[PDB]
Design a protein around this ligand. Structure first.
Ligand SMILES: O=C(O)c1ccnc(C(=O)O)c1
Ligand SMILES: [Mn+2]
Ligand code: NA
Ligand SMILES: [Zn+2]
Ligand SMILES: [Zn+2]
Length: 455
């Protein structure tokens, strides 16, 4: 009556045969899990990657978090903690909050209380949360090559489910990107405490994510399937329109806490789960998710992109354009990079890239015909991939240009994409130049190499 828990998301317990290949498994469960947005994966009982670190030498500065439903928070960014001192703070907080030992506090009660707490104006509870990229100063919870490693660690070094591997494996198309995009290739570490929260969001470029809880108390999740993404946004926009004002850049994205019952009242499907230590949660493309930690814990997560994802990635960039949102990378640049490496691509990958590339080329063909009819005549080849991102964003829609753009000597350095030829300046279009990475004639042999590779 006060909080009605959403239905549970799917839980999978793969055999060791099934577990051997994460991408095969994820493809397999996808028909089920994409209907719920998130799912949980329990590894085989003896898959137990060793965790080891010194709690006194690991330092980080956490973000302070107010817990108010519908209040704006920024998706990225008062004191430094070691893992030990954060833990001591975290345990004391929960212990004092409930006047109980921490293991005795029912997960159902922490959940109820979380939603009461964020709802109540009179309550002004603040907590702290660590969110930080895998670095030399704070490394992965999974074993990596560096130290002399134990046989136990060597067992899990090359695991597909070791989250350092998944990104740079042949089957995350993100692995092929040469643009560093560190925020999307490197794992992130999350040190949680009771009620510390992640707001409703989807991943950049509508990518997958995979989250492993190394140890500690559970992480509570809510997820919405990709097909219902715009439904959720419509609900949120009505209740919190300030979150939907356009952002000056990626460092100013606004997100918020919102009761899943509010979504369920508006017929948005929502699923929940308690992720416990040693379990994975996978989020699917464009699947909204949010949650909070039950207590002191330690999680690790990374984004990835399968061949299943490529056409959604193209759709995402089109969606970003319509919203004037910045891109993390150029999707077309990634496609062409892969084409230029057709001989070493996996064959199913080559086949899928070929299909996306065919759409890209046909769309590009139409756009160039349109701008020619606008009276843009001069053109010059341009290696867009050499420009810093902030030097190749469309003035109007902020898209990262790669296939082509329009420039005018009138405004040096400024570019518009071919959708916004009329937004560059007031000179007549005969003064403009079409800057292009490839002629259409360059592009067809590139696609053809993919075809040969694919057979
Ligand atoms: O704080 C987390 O555990 C979490 C969960 C899902 N997603 C994110 C994220 O930042 O993408 C963070
Ligand atoms: Mn996320
Ligand atoms: Na509150
Ligand atoms: Zn544009
Ligand atoms: Zn001009």
């Amino acid at each position: 009556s006060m909080f009605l828990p959403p239905p549970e998301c799917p839980v999978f317990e793969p055999s060791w045969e099934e577990f051997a290949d994460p991408f095969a498994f994820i493809h397999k469960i996808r028909p089920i899990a994409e209907q719920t947005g998130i799912c949980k994966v329990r590894p085989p009982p003896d898959w137990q990657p060793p965790f080891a670190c010194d709690v006194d030498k690991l330092h980080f500065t956490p973000r302070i978090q107010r817990l108010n439903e519908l209040e704006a928070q920024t998706r990225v960014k008062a004191r430094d903690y070691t893992l030990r001192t954060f833990g001591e703070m975290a345990d004391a907080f929960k212990s004092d909050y409930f006047n109980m030992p921490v293991h005795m506090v029912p997960t159902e009660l922490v959940e109820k209380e979380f939603w009461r707490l964020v709802s109540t104006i009179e309550e002004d509870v603040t907590v702290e949360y660590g969110a930080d990229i895998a670095s030399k100063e704070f490394g992965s919870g999974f074993p990596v090559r560096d130290i002399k490693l134990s046989p136990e660690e060597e067992e899990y070094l090359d695991s597909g489910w070791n989250l350092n591997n998944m990104p740079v494996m042949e089957q995350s198309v993100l692995a092929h990107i040469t643009a560093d995009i560190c925020g999307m290739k490197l794992p992130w570490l999350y040190v949680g405490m009771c009620f510390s929260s992640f707001c409703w969001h989807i991943e950049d470029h509508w990518s997958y994510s995979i989250n492993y809880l190394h140890w500690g108390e559970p992480k509570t999740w809510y997820g919405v399937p990709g097909y219902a993404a715009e439904q959720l946004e419509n609900v949120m926009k009505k209740l919190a329109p300030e979150l939907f004002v356009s952002q000056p850049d990626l460092l100013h994205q606004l997100v918020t806490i919102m009761n899943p019952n509010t979504l369920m009242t508006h017929e948005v499907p929502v699923y929940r789960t308690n992720q416990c230590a040693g379990e994975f949660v996978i989020t699917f493309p464009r699947a909204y998710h949010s949650g909070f930690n039950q207590g002191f814990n330690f999680a690790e997560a990374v984004n990835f992109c399968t061949v299943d994802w490529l056409p959604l990635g193209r759709q995402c960039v089109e969606h970003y354009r319509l919203l004037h949102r910045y891109c993390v990378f150029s999707h077309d640049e990634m496609i062409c990079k892969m084409a230029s490496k057709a001989d070493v691509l996996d064959v199913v990958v080559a086949s899928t890239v070929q299909k996306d590339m065919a759409i890209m080329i046909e769309d590009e063909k139409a756009l160039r015909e349109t701008v020619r009819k606008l009276g843009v005549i001069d053109s010059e080849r341009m290696d867009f991939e050499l420009l810093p991102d902030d030097e190749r964003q469309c003035v109007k829609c902020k898209t990262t240009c790669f296939m082509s753009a329009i420039s005018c000597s009138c405004k040096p350095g400024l570019l518009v994409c071919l959708h916004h030829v009329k937004e560059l300046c007031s000179c007549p279009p005969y003064k403009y130049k079409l800057r292009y990475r490839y002629t259409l004639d360059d592009l067809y042999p590139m696609m053809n190499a993919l075809k040969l590779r694919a057979e």
